[PDB]
Amino acid sequence: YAPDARNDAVLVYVNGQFVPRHQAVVSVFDAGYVCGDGVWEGVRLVDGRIVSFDAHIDRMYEGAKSIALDIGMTRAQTKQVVVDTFLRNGMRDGAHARLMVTRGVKKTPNQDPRFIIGGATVVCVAEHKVVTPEAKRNGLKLFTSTLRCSGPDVFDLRLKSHSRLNLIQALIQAIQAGADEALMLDPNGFVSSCNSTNFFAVRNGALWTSSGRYCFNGITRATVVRLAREAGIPVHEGDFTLAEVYAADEAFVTGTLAGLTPVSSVDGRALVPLGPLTQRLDALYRAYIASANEAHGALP
Amino acid sequence: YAPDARNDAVLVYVNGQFVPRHQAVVSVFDAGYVCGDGVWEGVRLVDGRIVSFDAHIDRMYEGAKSIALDIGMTRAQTKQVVVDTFLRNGMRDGAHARLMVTRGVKKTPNQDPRFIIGGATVVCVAEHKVVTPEAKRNGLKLFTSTLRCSGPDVFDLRLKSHSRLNLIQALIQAIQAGADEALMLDPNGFVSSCNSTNFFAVRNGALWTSSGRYCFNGITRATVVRLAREAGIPVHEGDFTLAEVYAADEAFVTGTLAGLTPVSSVDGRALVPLGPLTQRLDALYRAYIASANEAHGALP
Amino acid sequence: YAPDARNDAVLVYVNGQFVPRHQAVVSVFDAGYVCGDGVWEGVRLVDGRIVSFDAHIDRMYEGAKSIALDIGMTRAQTKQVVVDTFLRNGMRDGAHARLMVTRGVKKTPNQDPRFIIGGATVVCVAEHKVVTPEAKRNGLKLFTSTLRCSGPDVFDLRLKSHSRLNLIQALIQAIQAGADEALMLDPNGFVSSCNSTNFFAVRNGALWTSSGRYCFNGITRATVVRLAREAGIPVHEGDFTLAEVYAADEAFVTGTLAGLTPVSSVDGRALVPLGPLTQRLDALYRAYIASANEAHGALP
Amino acid sequence: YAPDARNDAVLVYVNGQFVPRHQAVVSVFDAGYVCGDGVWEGVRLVDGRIVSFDAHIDRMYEGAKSIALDIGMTRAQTKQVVVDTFLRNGMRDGAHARLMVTRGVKKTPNQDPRFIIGGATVVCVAEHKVVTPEAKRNGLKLFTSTLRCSGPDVFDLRLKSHSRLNLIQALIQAIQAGADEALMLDPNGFVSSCNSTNFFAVRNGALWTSSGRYCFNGITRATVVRLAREAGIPVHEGDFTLAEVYAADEAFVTGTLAGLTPVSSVDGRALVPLGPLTQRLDALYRAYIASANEAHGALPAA
Amino acid sequence: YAPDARNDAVLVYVNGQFVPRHQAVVSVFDAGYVCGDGVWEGVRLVDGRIVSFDAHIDRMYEGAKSIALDIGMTRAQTKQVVVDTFLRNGMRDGAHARLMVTRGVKKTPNQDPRFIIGGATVVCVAEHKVVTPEAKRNGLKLFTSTLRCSGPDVFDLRLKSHSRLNLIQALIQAIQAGADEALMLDPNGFVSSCNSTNFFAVRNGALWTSSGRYCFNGITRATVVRLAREAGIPVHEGDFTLAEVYAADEAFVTGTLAGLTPVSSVDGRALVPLGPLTQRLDALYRAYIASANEAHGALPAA
Amino acid sequence: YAPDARNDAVLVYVNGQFVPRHQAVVSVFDAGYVCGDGVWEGVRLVDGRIVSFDAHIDRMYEGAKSIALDIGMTRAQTKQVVVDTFLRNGMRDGAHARLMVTRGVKKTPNQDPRFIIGGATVVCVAEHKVVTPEAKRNGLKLFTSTLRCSGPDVFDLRLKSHSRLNLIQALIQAIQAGADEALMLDPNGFVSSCNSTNFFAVRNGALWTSSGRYCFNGITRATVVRLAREAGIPVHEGDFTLAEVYAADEAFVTGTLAGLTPVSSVDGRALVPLGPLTQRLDALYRAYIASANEAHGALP
């Protein structure tokens, strides 16, 4: 994400006030800081539209619901927080907002979610975040961590939460292998996802990606699958192995921030970055997020 | 933990400064708040000695090491932070300190642990925390959550971390069952631990507790096992079932904060709280933490 | 399922004879009583027709086959036992028959299935069983037990057997949570079924239910899936989580006895009982069981 | 268990009454028949003593407790049921009693354990059951079933219950392999137990048996381990494999009914039945069950 | 595979040379012999065509790629090895070639795949292998081994490798049960495959086979599924149980060597061999392998 | 293991004959080459004694027994093959023999073990193999592969077999991470062993190593455990984690070929090679293998 001096003077939304980023703060009694106890969303602003905005806010509401966290706001109010954060920083384009809603402040740090004073802590950081396509062109080195995605009875990886050491530990190992991102296997040993992005492989003209049973169900992921199906591109959504990845023609990772990022290697096995099907899906994706489809909520 | 107006005016240690608790804050760019990315310790102050102090600080150093987090301080400096926090609030007794060390502030929120400006964020909250023995006498209702302790390849539960939604989710379900705390099973179905405390059962004069393979290895836990062995009390450290708990004579939970807290029921099956062996071990425990054993680091 | 004094004088089929309910008995040497060793079926009589009758009898024959149990009767003879049980109690409507076929009497209690004198014990209990729709309207509290559905290499839950402590133990825990029925997870942590009924959730106008890989594949379940597809309702058969359940709009359970029973809560998270799609499917189901249909067996 | 015509006329205890075996019956509404919903115990009478009697009754009370089943009786009363069953059939020796306590009768068959009329159904079948030591000498063929012991969160195998299709299905497969009993693996693939007995192997003059974390913790099992430790026979309670079994010098199975029964093969691999250590442990066991030990309950000389 | 004296004098391809079968040899330093470290393929010659030839060669190249093994040859060259082996033995029909490519010779036996002198060892054994349809008619006894298919993070069973003790051990147990082949379960307990062939069951006029997530994805398997779908025979690729197998009307196993082989029993439960749907699929398969389809590679009329 | 031109002219034992290394061959019909179907042993010759010789031969006999492979030889005859291989190459010291017994030649390649003509193929390769202690001093980089040790119902890793792609695949990944050897986890996630050697860690003056339930139970491993207990060093055989490894003071790997080899890093976390306890145990081991001891077999 290619740097920008405007990032240094962005205003941050904190419980209704707009604060210089150097002074944007939360209490050391906040459930987020203490316990990792909240949910969050990343949404990208493209030519005056927030990409998949309503989808992201639905997901936030579902994730909060799953950990019995009261956002303290209607869907409309939650969206206006994001809209006002972009507006306050004069952003219409090339911008990314992180919306963080943590459970709130506690009289004393504990795990019990009932003992909360006020309501949810709401933070929105909006920044200038444009991927310089030298990063697109070279792509990512992936290493398959020894650390596994969890089953939902242990920790549901569909939740976009403030408790992220599970993923960070996978990343640390991949970095120590000389890589940029971690590929993770599911509890059965099949390819699941990456530590911060979803994972796709390309094999004989077809797009392969996990079931999503044991990883984050990214909106970029679901859009890319949808565009592929709509374009008549065969999709295999289900169980595949490292052997199938190693013999793949192409691969890429997805997320709101980078979009489609090519993979140049997995476990040291080279893949041509920006193969022909990655390019085709990339074209479809960028067309979709830059279009007047109102899945992309219009900025006031 | 029976309330105290002195709690409202405690000074909090934050990166070297002492701050009123109403104004003790960390950046919304801090790895703790964003990612749940740090380690912590609770230590109890008893008659001018910090209980098991050196043990807790060793554990912190090991946990930080496991997630490649630089505390940025020697063991001596880390202890002086705690000592000075107690000292600054005029505490010699009936006090508990939470020491929180999060990875630090980032230019932009991400998972990558390398992109850190300055070093570790260090917070120490010291409070007046005395359990009113009406809480001892009645004990806790436990419910066995459907949510499981993880294996170490998924998320090592020996780590005392800022990523706690795994445990909090277990708690939420136990509360909805009408209970106070959650009992958790290991991935094989055997009794592991509670969501915020360790778990013991008593059967025919013997103390039963998990292997600790799949839960937090509490210092209170290890002290209680040690005192029991030293007193000739038979200990079974290993795999046991809910059936064995349900047929138990007594049970209790351990942690720095409450010490030994009796259990009055598990899954609705009554147990006499403060049975005769809980009382005996409780006597030994309190004697140990109030003694001039220098495992209890002496306050300057 | 709301009382009727005719229940006290029903005749029970026992190995070819019809016996007063207070005198209907099996030997203490019977494999059913000793070992839980048999299969059973519940079939409902509606307006002169046995609902899905041949489906139930095929299932019985497959289940018996799986545990190498010789029913001792043709499909025709098995059906006539049920038909004659209804007939003997003058039942045309609002009645339920339990058909129990246990392995038989043994010289001595053991598990060896070959040491059997005579054939299968065959019992049929028919009762007057109408759900008073105040039970429909208020619905069930569900609690997700810590006890799991098994895989087929442990014990295949497709079998409708006399060995039911696996399910009853899940129920006992849910009752102690203040609930009416137990929701059960599969060995991978995904929602599977209830202890005595199959489980559906409703989310965004679609119906969600397990794969059935790890639970009882109820005929009511399969009928409701078919009716939903018939009526243009999207159906998602597969792996879903407690998070997805907790965010659902409606939920209900299925079985021959109650039909569709709404769910009022799961793990303490409230759901409005008799939501709009539960109503719709309930209407379709009742129409189906009261129609002439070739799936239904005619009473003479 | 080598046959005896007296078995045909034994009286059976059924809720306080003593009934001819041809007429010993339970209601078709009983949770035992319907749901497999009860616990049971087998106890052996040897020379006027019920072997390990209080241990069996403790186990019953714990197992009942685990499925929230009220036996309806004190430990004393439960024992008298067994004692009276032996007494009523004039049995002083060479006899086995199966005590079955099911949850009771229900107004309608369901799973809900609350809706019970009366109390527990209590049945006690006592029979003349003496193993003719030609059965000892030849021993059992074992086959390792594909069907697995469960973990405790699925179904705890320490419970001696009326729900036995889990074990029966393992047996069915072993019989179809030409064997007499099923060996079962635990969820991790280590040797656990047999479908109706516990399992021991002998290797390098030491005794090997499972941890018991994933199988029935037999009283015969616990006695054999204790006698071995008392006698300086090395005993290893823990995880071992089929490879270790296949290389073993001897093996045997334990249970109240047969005592120690030698194994003649596992998965087709021959083992000499009644090897030297099986014999030695067998001698110790029989001496123990024929002793005046206060683990054994006195039968009245009545 | 019903015998033929010509098998005794076949020439074997060994790194470019054609050698009498009595003298076809590899070094004791070869990774294949030492470590089980190679991939292989079986291909069948039918009326001048190598059945599914390019599919087998694709699979080999993927499997080699998965264990970072350099075959040392283009796809073209690899095919010519097979073609020349058939040609050298004057085989136009009724013949099977096993192509074995092991990692090569090492200066010293170790696991490290880098320290290799020369390239891959390439062996091709072609034999006369025609199944006498008395073997078709009677079919196979299956026993479900206690030994399990692995997940891909333990050992991926899609790889056709020189490390086969995992499958052989399942076979050993099934033979000791009186059977001919082993049925294996997946890590979750569902039916996966057989130790040397894929597994199908027939139930209510539909064909059932595993997902293939936990077993060898046979080309015969994939062909049979495709022919069934093409013909409007319902096919269910997914998880099913032993209970479903035991209640099945028919079953069969697939592989390049035998084609479709009926099953006469599973765990002692009899199945009529060559049931009506097995026959129909068998007819379709034989027609397919005897067709001019561009899936099949031409053998020179040389 | 540092080169010697005598290796080029060693004679190899092949079914009773002694053959030049360049001409030592097995049939392409041999179960070893085709199927990986055999067992092997490495034994080291030190100052006229074969280290732990009878232990290795007992192990071979047990492994063969487990896969129903008839060695075709008494223990005495098996040993004489090794002894004669050493003798024929004039080796008294600094030599290693690999004894390979594969199932034999088959009429046709298949997996069925009964279709064997003649008996076991027996091969013995003896070489001059001295570790130049610059290899000792620098030690090994370890990477924890994503590929797991199996349980015994999948494939028992106590067996020293000719089917080694399970271990080699773990190695390939570790090499691609920039490491020398692979650390492997057990099916529960705990540290098990290395791909070709056993694994120890040192923490606070104690030695830690796996239970051996899920890996090769090396003779060097058992010797080092025994020497440690002999020398008053606490030994912890059981389940431990990557976190515990990462915080360790030292680590090393064991095997007949190298003896004790220090570890310089695990997953990129540095460990000082030849720490004080590794040195101590290394001294004890070398003393042991150079002593007269009854465990050692005398060369004639």
Brief rundown of the structure:
Chains A, B, C, F: It holds the Pfam family Aminotran_4. The first copy, chain A, has 300 residues and is of the alpha+beta class.
Topology:
The structure is a homohexamer.
Chain A: E1 11-14, E2 17-20, E3 25-27, H1 31-35, E4 38-46, E5 49-50, H2 53-66, H3 75-88, E6 95-102, E7 105-106, E8 116-117, E9 121-128, H4 133-138, E10 140-144, H5 152-155, H6 165-176, E11 181-185, E12 191-194, E13 198-203, E14 206-209, H7 219-230, E15 235-237, H8 242-246, E16 250-255, E17 259-266, E18 269-270, H9 276-289, E19 297-298
Parallel strand pairs in A: 10-11, 10-17, 14-15
Antiparallel strand pairs in A: 1-2, 1-9, 4-5, 4-6, 5-19, 6-9, 7-8, 11-12, 13-14, 13-16, 16-17, 17-18
CATH topology of the largest domain in chain A: D-amino Acid Aminotransferase, Chain A, domain 2
N to C succession of SSEs of chain A: EEEHEEHHEEEEHEHHEEEEHEHEEEHE
Q: Approximately how much beta-strand content do the residues of chain A carry?
A: 25-35%
Percentage of residues in helical conformation of chain A? 25-40%
Total domains of chain A, how many?
2
CATH architecture of the largest domain in chain A: Alpha-Beta Barrel
Biggest interface goes to: A-B, 59 and 59 residues
Family (chains D, E): Belongs to the class-IV pyridoxal-phosphate-dependent aminotransferase family.
EC number (chains D, E): 2.6.1.42
Organism (chains D, E): Variovorax paradoxus B4
GO molecular function, one term (chains D, E): branched-chain-amino-acid transaminase activity
Describe the structure in your own words.
- Six copies of one chain form a homohexamer.
- Chain A has 300 residues and is an alpha+beta fold.
- Chain A has two domains: 125 residues, Aminotransferase class 4, branched-chain amino acid transferase, N-terminal domain (D-amino Acid Aminotransferase, Chain A, domain 1); 156 residues, Alpha-Beta Barrel (D-amino Acid Aminotransferase, Chain A, domain 2).
- Chain A is built from nine helices and 19 strands.
- In chain A, strands 10, 11, 12, 13, 14, 15, 16, 17 and 18 form a nine-stranded mixed sheet that branches.
- In chain A, a hairpin with a 5-residue loop joins strand 11 and strand 12.
- The longest helix of chain A has 14 residues.
- Chains in contact: A-B, A-C, A-E, A-F, B-C, B-D, B-F, C-D, C-E, D-E, D-F, E-F.
- Chains A and B meet through strand 3, helix 1, strand 6, strand 9 and helix 5 of A and strand 3, helix 1, strand 6, strand 9 and helix 5 of B.
